[PDB]
Design a protein around this ligand. Structure first.
Ligand code: HEC
Length: 99
């Protein structure tokens, strides 16, 4: 809901890999609606879950993400931050990642 706060957090925690909604590591697994839909995760609740726990080559960010090697070696994000990020991603995907 707070777009500017979500954008700021996204820019520092996510953008290097998901530049403008993309995926610089894994083609086909972007944050665009088409890929989110194909991968079964075009919802806020699914975006939150994958951000929290990770999946293959993406680290999880949740406080209770486990085991250690599947999660960020940087600081974990709080639930509220991951919720803001999931809402931001869903909103941006719905809008087509405006530039
Ligand atoms: C690189 C080190 C990444 C960072 C930092 C973040 N993500 Fe990521 N993400 C990355 C990869 C390699 C993948 C694909 C994983 C796979 O095996 O499928 C993803 C995937 C996502 C998805 C799902 C996209 C889809 O299925 O099309 C989402 C919703 C997602 N990532 C969100 C996300 C957020 C919110 C991040 C910051 C907190 C973030 N990612 C960081 C690589 C990387």
């Amino acid at each position: 809901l707070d777009i500017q706060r979500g954008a700021t957090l996204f820019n520092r925690a996510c953008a290097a890999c998901h530049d403008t909604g993309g995926n610089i590591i894994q083609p086909g697994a972007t944050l665009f609606t088409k890929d989110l839909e194909r991968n079964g995760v075009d919802t806020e609740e699914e975006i939150y879950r994958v951000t929290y726990f990770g999946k293959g080559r993406m680290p999880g960010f949740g406080e209770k993400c486990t085991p250690r090697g599947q999660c960020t070696f940087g600081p974990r994000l709080q639930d509220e931050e991951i919720k803001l990020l999931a809402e931001f991603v869903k909103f941006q995907a719905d809008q087509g990642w405006p530039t």
